[PDB]
Symmetry: C2
């Protein structure tokens, strides 16, 4: 059997700036064999779900000095985190029928020649799409960023930006259940309302309807901020610095306001870091897979007990992957942006 294998390719490198749909092209003509090559040590996946993640945009720009991940290649499939089902395997740790998450192609079938970076899914009763976010890379990021990087203590005053996002909605709930006071910023009233009801944040505000971020942070933090879970950067970062307490911490998870800027914004008040003895620390979840067992143990139990809430934004079909990715930098995604490529056989779960 040879079968159809649609793909989304990167049409070309793009300059600093925003990505556009037309930087990527769907190809419907491709095909694939349903067995791994003889002599291989490899896994063929049927791909089921794809994650759209903000870090993916930077990969659409050529870098001369190797960054932490390899750039995409013009004319090759876009790649990113997703979930697949093993169709065939010449690697002993993977059997036909296993479900796995890892870096896979923006396509219907991916032949993975380095299986070692696939994670076998051990909990298939949990909806599989969760392994693209909360139980995948995104959730581990929340966990490492909050519990390790932030050094939290009960009672501390915590601010999360992009707080209705995939990372931030998780962070908020961890902080809350840790016994912290928690405030989030988000880009719409719908998000704000989700933060205050569904996610149990103490307060939230719509950053786009604030003419002054410093004063706004001052409203919700009359004694200032202990901990900032930084997802955005820009002027929001300056506003936090101004409102930060002595021995405050900032876990620099990301800086999404800067990713599509020809010209990144200046941060002006870093000297506050001296007199306030602030630690500003970046981290990359790719260094922390060693933590996964402790994390998955904690998060699977929370999910199975309904003591954490999670919101996915689902888009149906490979074809809609590119726009969904672009949507992230406009804040179109409401929750964690997933793309269904093909739903696994015998699903029977309802939705609205």
């Amino acid at each position: 059997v040879v079968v159809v294998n649609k793909q989304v390719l990167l049409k070309h490198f793009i300059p600093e700036g925003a990505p556009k749909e037309t930087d990527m092209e769907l190809v419907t003509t491709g095909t694939i064999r349903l067995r791994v090559p003889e002599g291989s040590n490899a896994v063929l996946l049927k791909n089921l779900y794809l994650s759209c993640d903000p870090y993916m945009r930077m990969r659409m720009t050529k870098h001369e000095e190797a960054s932490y991940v390899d750039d995409f290649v013009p004319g090759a499939p876009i790649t990113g985190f997703g979930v697949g089902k093993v169709v065939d395997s010449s690697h002993p740790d993977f059997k036909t029928g296993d479900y796995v998450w890892g870096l896979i192609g923006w396509e219907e079938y991916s032949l993975i020649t380095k299986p070692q970076g696939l994670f076998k899914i051990h909990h298939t009763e949990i909806p599989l799409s969760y392994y693209t976010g909360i139980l995948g890379m995104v959730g581990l990021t929340a966990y490492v960023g909050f519990y390790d990087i932030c050094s939290p203590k009960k009672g501390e005053r915590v601010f999360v930006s992009a707080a209705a996002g995939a990372v931030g909605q998780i962070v908020g709930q961890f902080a809350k259940q840790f016994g912290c006071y928690v405030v989030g910023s988000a880009g719409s009233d719908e998000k704000v309302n989700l933060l205050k009801t569904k996610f149990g944040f103490d307060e939230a505000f719509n950053y786009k309807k604030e003419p002054d971020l410093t004063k706004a942070l001052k409203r919700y933090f009359p004694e200032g901020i202990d901990i900032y879970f930084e997802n955005v950067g820009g002027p929001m970062l300056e506003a936090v610095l101004h409102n930060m307490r002595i021995k405050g911490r900032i876990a620099a998870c990301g800086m999404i306001s800067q990713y599509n800027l020809e010209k990144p914004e200046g941060v002006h008040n870093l000297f506050l870091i001296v007199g306030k003895r602030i630690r500003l620390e970046g981290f990359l979840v790719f260094d922390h897979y060693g933590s996964y067992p402790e994390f998955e143990e904690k998060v699977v139990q929370l999910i199975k007990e309904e003591k954490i809430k999670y919101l996915e934004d689902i888009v149906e079909g490979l074809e809609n992957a590119p726009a969904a990715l672009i949507g992230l930098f406009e804040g179109r995604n409401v929750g964690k942006q997933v793309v269904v490529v093909s739903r696994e056989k015998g699903h029977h779960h309802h939705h609205h």
Copy 2:
């Protein structure tokens, strides 16, 4: 027994911008009685040596919200670290003839009503002026900053801004002795040459003669920088971040480039901290006086063994303190800036 007590007063608060000599006045008519008051709990000092330190500038500006340290007060003496001799004492832990360091008045005699701020000097064989710098607040800064905040490991690559300055000349040596590759930036060819001969830095450069700081750092760090001891801020930091290695650390000691500017400059590449997993951390020596005893011991041994070098810029006389202080922000000080207010009798040789 009343005597003359000359003082250097803050004339007035100053706005955003650069301080100058004339923001201070020397007054010569005042006098003081050489005993502490009965029932007092105090220590009367004859002040010997005074430190000029960069943080002093910020104290000349009014702050409606409280910085780490009180603003100076117009009409009242300038204060700062120094070294003093106890003339009279109504506080148990201090006796007549003892030597101490701590915050004292810019004047000839200071009656200290908060004696718990003072530290007795236990090595009087070392020149007492050392306790305004290498053995005082300045040395402890270097030691906390490097040994604790920078988390150093044998064989890492270290860059120091204001490297010929007091803090930075100590940092560089601590680092070289820790087995690190060390480079420093300074604002003169003379300072650059001191960093390489006297202070054992591996390389150094005149920031003022580099049109591209990013490229300059790349010349000296072909595989990037592990540790940046940050005394300067601004475009230099930006340049550092561009050249910093995976899991780099920046100990934010201070950002002197920013202290006399109406508009502080913007850092544009802070996002690199995520992708390179950089820790940037401010510290204040004020929080770390618990480390003093062990630090003192360590640096005393280095001095005894001649395993560390130290250069002081010495000015003679209180009247010369104001210029001395201003010089700091122009980089006129060559070494740790000291003012001798009065020498203790019985003495080392200088040139």
